[PDB]
């Protein structure tokens, strides 16, 4: 049993590509249920389906990330254990293939006070000590406990200037995950993407799973993305950003609501529940006449497992 | 053209021998801010020139005198925030350069403010390239006359650390965080948090005191966030915390620790006196375990 929601961007529409982000999504939402399937940890789940988003060359992230101000490819990840609450993320890394790769690596050695966060050539060298390959986008998991996981994975700004990191590599910012407890009725996953220089300046994953602890989460995650994204930004214009979010509950049978949310003219996702096996994809858009910058898409559905 | 700062030099073991140093940076570090609120500065400005003061003391962990990293290195961590902007500048695993904080404090002001974050060489490049001498935990909270308030911290993080690594102070919302009042708080608020450890990261520390302190009891708002946030998820550090509201204007600072001791220094631009002060723990209570928390009251026009 087990469930899994991945996003491939929220960006500029392109008809152009879009059937290449469905194709990605859905290899990426199966290596996740497989590994699942396989009894494998949510947080390798999590990294399985964020390696074959990287891997595309159409994603802002690992192979095909946009190039910094010196020409060069520099890299933001971060993932985030439920169960554990213990967080790995990695800041601008270079030539290390999948960056979620180093900062899963960082959370399991944090499971056994071991580093946390590692960035430049500091994460480069640490990443290679640890037996890791050379030379926006997002995954949310729980599997058939409860256990949630969540990871986040970019290639930041077009000519950024060297050594700038961004929301994906911040504890709270990029992506969020936390189980039931005592104060967390239902167990929560966020992965988040921005865009543009223009970016939101809260905890957005971190704010978006306590939202999500009242009672209606799909007007929860609206009314946040309306204020965080629209609303708050005194003369400023529409934050662009997508987020994926998935938060469950035991009633034995598991509830899982999920939901995606966007301000940029589309976004594409992709899910997959292992009980049925069948991988779907779709292409969120914003409705017309509505300008990217201050209108919300949002769509979701629910899922009960065993 | 008024206003009031609260600084810290380090939340950690007691040592009778360092402790008239410590206490003698605060000292300094508020008379370089209180120097700059009366000559018509930003807020961000006197926070910056607090740091500065406390970064260069030899015993402060954060800029000269900075712990050593696995490589014998110094990688610096530091930021700071204005609460009318809600601007952030910060730099992590930061080498070659004397004050990390006046690097963070530039990335906000080369700003027209959109928020910016340069790590390693990267931010040594940025720093070079803009006129910040290059060189052979400390925080500060303040607001000014008209409530303004603003926050920085600085950090050499953990000896031995891997390199690259980066810590609470370079991260946004744990180390520091500074807030004007809105429609969310009456108060304005600002934070610097103290201490090293991930306990301050994997926390959001520094932002959950501001918001906490939205809260009518400020003792009470601390002493709740010390507690259920902090001791509950050993855990060593500490924070600064000062809060603004219109009556003319009050404000009210307050500090805690759960390390044995932590070095405070306050000043108001109206009086001349800085005081500074030593906070311990009391007798029977195991640093990590336990919470101490102090604090008084200003009035400013
Ligand atoms: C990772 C821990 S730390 O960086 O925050 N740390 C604790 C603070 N020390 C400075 C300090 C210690 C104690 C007090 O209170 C007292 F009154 F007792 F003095 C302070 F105000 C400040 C840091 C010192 O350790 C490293 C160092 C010393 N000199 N240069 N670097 C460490
Ligand atoms: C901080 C930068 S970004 O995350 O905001 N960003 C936005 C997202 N696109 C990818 C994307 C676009 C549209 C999508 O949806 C659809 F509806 F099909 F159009 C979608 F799913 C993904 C990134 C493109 O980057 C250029 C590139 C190409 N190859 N490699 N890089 C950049
Ligand atoms: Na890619
Ligand atoms: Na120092």
């Given at each position: 049993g087990g469930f899994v929601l991945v996003h491939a961007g929220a960006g500029y529409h392109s008809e152009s590509k879009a059937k290449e982000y469905k194709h990605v999504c859905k290899r990426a939402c199966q290596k996740a249920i497989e590994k699942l399937q396989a009894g494998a940890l949510a947080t390798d789940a999590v990294t399985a389906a964020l390696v074959e988003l990287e891997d595309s060359?159409?994603?802002?992230?690992?192979?095909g990330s946009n190039l910094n101000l010196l020409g060069e490819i520099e890299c933001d990840a971060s993932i985030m254990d439920g169960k554990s609450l213990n967080f790995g993320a990695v800041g601008a890394?270079?030539?290390?293939?999948?960056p979620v790769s180093v900062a899963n690596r960082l959370l399991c050695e944090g499971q056994k006070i071991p580093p946390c966060f590692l960035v430049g050539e500091g994460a480069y060298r640490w990443a290679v000590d640890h037996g890791i390959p050379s030379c926006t986008v997002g995954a949310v998991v729980v599997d058939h406990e409860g256990n949630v996981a969540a990871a986040v994975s970019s290639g930041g700004?077009?000519?950024?200037?060297?050594?700038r990191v961004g929301q994906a590599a911040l504890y709270g910012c990029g992506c969020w995950a936390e189980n039931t407890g005592a104060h967390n009725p239902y167990s929560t996953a966020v992965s988040t993407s921005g865009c543009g220089e223009?970016?939101?300046?809260?905890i957005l994953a971190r704010e978006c799973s306590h939202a999500l602890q009242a009672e209606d989460a799909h007007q929860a995650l609206l009314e946040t993305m309306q204020n965080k994204?629209?609303?708050?930004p005194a003369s400023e214009d529409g934050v662009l950003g997508g987020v994926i979010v998935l938060r469950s509950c035991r009633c034995q049978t598991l509830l899982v609501e999920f939901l995606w949310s966007h301000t940029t003219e589309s976004m594409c996702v992709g899910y997959m529940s292992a009980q049925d096996g069948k991988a779907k994809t779709h292409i969120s858009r914003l409705p017309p006449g509505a300008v990217a910058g201050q209108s919300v898409a949002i769509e979701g559905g629910v899922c009960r497992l065993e």
């Amino acid at each position: 049993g087990g469930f899994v929601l991945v996003h491939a961007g929220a960006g500029y529409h392109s008809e152009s590509k879009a059937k290449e982000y469905k194709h990605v999504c859905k290899r990426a939402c199966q290596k996740a249920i497989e590994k699942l399937q396989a009894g494998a940890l949510a947080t390798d789940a999590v990294t399985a389906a964020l390696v074959e988003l990287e891997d595309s060359p159409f994603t802002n992230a690992g192979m095909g990330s946009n190039l910094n101000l010196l020409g060069e490819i520099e890299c933001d990840a971060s993932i985030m254990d439920g169960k554990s609450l213990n967080f790995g993320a990695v800041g601008a890394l270079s030539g290390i293939k999948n960056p979620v790769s180093v900062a899963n690596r960082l959370l399991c050695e944090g499971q056994k006070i071991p580093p946390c966060f590692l960035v430049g050539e500091g994460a480069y060298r640490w990443a290679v000590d640890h037996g890791i390959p050379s030379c926006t986008v997002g995954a949310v998991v729980v599997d058939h406990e409860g256990n949630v996981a969540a990871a986040v994975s970019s290639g930041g700004l077009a000519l950024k200037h060297p050594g700038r990191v961004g929301q994906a590599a911040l504890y709270g910012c990029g992506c969020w995950a936390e189980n039931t407890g005592a104060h967390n009725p239902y167990s929560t996953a966020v992965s988040t993407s921005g865009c543009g220089e223009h970016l939101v300046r809260t905890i957005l994953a971190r704010e978006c799973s306590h939202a999500l602890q009242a009672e209606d989460a799909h007007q929860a995650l609206l009314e946040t993305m309306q204020n965080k994204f629209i609303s708050s930004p005194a003369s400023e214009d529409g934050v662009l950003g997508g987020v994926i979010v998935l938060r469950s509950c035991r009633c034995q049978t598991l509830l899982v609501e999920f939901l995606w949310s966007h301000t940029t003219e589309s976004m594409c996702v992709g899910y997959m529940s292992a009980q049925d096996g069948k991988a779907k994809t779709h292409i969120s858009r914003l409705p017309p006449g509505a300008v990217a910058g201050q209108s919300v898409a949002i769509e979701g559905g629910v899922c009960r497992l065993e």
